[PDB]
Subunit: 130 residues, 2 copies
């Protein structure tokens, strides 16, 4: 009784790229590709109280009103210590921000997920320097 | 929008997966999987097509010893020669000898990855890691 189904929810842009990759790489279903991705990513981590330096890279829609304020509210309410943020415009729609910060594993993970979840944020990717 | 779809897999495999959800800050299995999917699709995209494209954007994060003679200049020379275009560099001191810099880069996937490899190989560079982005994520 070893095969189960579990649901996955994808934003449409990601789902469209997944479908294109299934076609380009000769997979026969979304289920097959995702399954293989999971198998692969495993081969390729405990959170702790130790202070670490980290960088969060965020790409966001700079026309989204109040988005910067929300990010600031999250940064200030997080237990992390943000050293600095730097932001540049990529194009007429998007900006890229790098946030350099220090905190423990729990605090930094939470910040990444809170920012990543905001409407208008295209992604929030973390680099940890432990 | 958001479109949900079903994935089938062996319970054994699923147990390891469902195992890092609560650990990775997630509330549902999707989000570890969503991020694995994102990561893998970006890698695939960077692996293909354009030796002529120069539209990729990335961030290289470096920790290095700025007391070391010529290291700062060496990293600059490497950058100048890579063909990549540096959009912005931010630097902070972590201690007396070590700085962290974030370098926002534009260029082709080849040039950017090589820049990372070359910088990472220098004496006095303690850490060099690239954050990759693909246009399907933001366009």
């Amino acid at each position: 009784d070893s095969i189960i189904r579990f649901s996955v929810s994808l934003q449409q842009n990601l789902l469209d790229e997944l479908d294109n990759r299934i076609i380009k790489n000769g997979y026969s279903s979304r289920s097959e590709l995702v399954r293989d991705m999971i198998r692969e990513k495993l081969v390729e981590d405990n959170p702790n109280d130790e202070s670490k330096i980290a960088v969060l890279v965020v790409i966001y829609d700079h026309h989204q009103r109040e988005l910067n304020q929300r990010m600031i509210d999250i940064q200030h309410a997080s237990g992390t210590h943000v050293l600095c943020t730097t932001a540049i415009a990529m194009d007429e729609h998007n900006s890229l921000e790098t946030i350099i910060l220090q905190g423990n594993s729990f605090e930094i993970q939470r910040l990444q997920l809170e920012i990543g979840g905001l409407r208008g944020v295209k992604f929030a990717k973390l680099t940890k320097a432990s």
